[PDB]
Amino acid sequence: SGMVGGIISWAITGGIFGDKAEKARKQKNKLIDEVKDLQSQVKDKSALQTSVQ
């Protein structure tokens, strides 16, 4: 938002939202790695259900 006229406000909203952009991206880092791990359980259990049957 800031630097259109507000060079001072660049650090303001970047301090406010750039944290929350970074935090949501870290949630985006964490959950994609979990879904990739949760998909890997489904892949083995699908191969498991074939193996048992």
Binding site: S1, V4, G5, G6, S9, I16, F17
Partner: protein
């Protein structure tokens, strides 16, 4: 004991199903704030469709320093209005979070 716990499945299947709509009501209200983009916001910071009018009504103020304050007025407004719209989006997301 089997009938004890399936009678506890029924609140948890409903309470999950209650929060499914209450999640999506936040999502529908986040879509209003979603609706303008990065550069729609940057399109608003230029006072164009009034920026010629920003220099039409301020033709004798070229000797005045305060013409730039008239320029600086509405940009100082609209920088704040987009903050609060996103600041609504902060409290809107943290509920959903």
């Amino acid at each position: 004991q089997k009938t004890e716990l399936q009678s506890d499945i029924d609140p948890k299947t409903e309470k999950r199903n209650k929060l499914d709509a209450d999640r999506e009501k936040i999502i529908e209200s986040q879509d209003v704030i979603r609706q303008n983009n990065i550069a729609d916001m940057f399109k608003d910071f230029i006072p164009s469709a009034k920026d010629i009018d920003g220099l039409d009504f301020t033709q004798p103020k070229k000797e005045a320093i305060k013409q730039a304050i008239k320029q600086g007025a509405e940009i100082a407004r609209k920088i704040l209005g987009k903050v609060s719209e996103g600041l609504k989006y902060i409290d809107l997301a943290d509920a959903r979070m």
